[PDB]
A and B are shown apart, each in its own frame.
Chain A
């Protein structure tokens, strides 16, 4: 499994937005959470999520705290409801990638079966195009072990809903 494409369930977009809005998230501040679904295939399917408690220092990007116990404890409970919806990565409200993201990403590698997906949900909705960007971390050992470079690979994504949600979405807009 070398990833190529990503689908997002409308419920995840709404969950990220609701998470953002309910935490009175101030300007310059971001909310962060866990995404769930399927990432064993070339197309990654993001079908669920949950919110994380997360703190970072606005004046020093090297300092942030993710509650590892919280990830595991909440993940435990998710498996008891749907064992098919696995931990596949994380999300935040961005709007852009931050300096700590490569390192936060590393921590999620402990919880995922494959290379973690980072999903940025633009909760300000100012692009007017798609309010999501999908990233995967890649590293390349260039020049034979004098240096390696690590960066985020942008994956195209699309909003895809299963029937149950299709019905919900149309009911809400109509």
Chain B
């Protein structure tokens, strides 16, 4: 019954690369992939957003350019880094996630800590807002929860990776 977010090889490497590059600042980007059954979210790819310190024109520009090269996937959420600050959602993040969930209920917010991430342990989590308003009309409290994370690689990607040393 547990829903898992399956993050691809390049999506993981891009997130770690972008997080590390931004230190000591937080960075952010969008996650691309697909929703399958109730228990499955695939994150196939990712792209960095410019330091604001969620640009719509940049996003739309990127999506359109990626589609011309066979990257046709929908936005399934977003990631951000917490350089040395672990995994959680701030109140600004909850609000950001709220806007993602108005487009897709199953949207995911990934958080990575590029400073605590070290050989043998990636410090990462995937969040989704808790459902309130089950009793709201159409016409002691936690605001979010964690989803399990896993990783996917094709057999070809596996053979490729063997070449690192």
Contact = CB atoms under 8 A, between A and B. Distances in A.
Interface of A: 10-11, 13-15, 17-19, 21-24, 51-53, 70, 73-74, 77, 80-82, 125, 130-131, 159, 161-173
Contacts of A73: 61, 65
Given A73-B61, A80-B58, A171-B151, A166 B160 contact: no
Contacts, number: 110
Contacts of B45: 18
A173 B158 contact: yes
Contacts of A162: 17, 20
B158 A168 contact: no
Interface in B45-98: 45, 48-50, 58, 61-62, 65-66, 68-71
A125 B157 CA distance: 10
A167 B156 contact: no
A159 B58 contact: no
Given A81-B50, A163-B20, A53 B160 contact: no
Interface in B73-128: 114, 117-120, 122
Contact of B9 (A80, A167, A172): A172
Given A14-B10, A23-B69, A164-B17, A77 B61 contact: yes
Contact of A167 (B62, B71, B119, B151): B119
Contact of B122 (A17, A77, A161, A171): A171
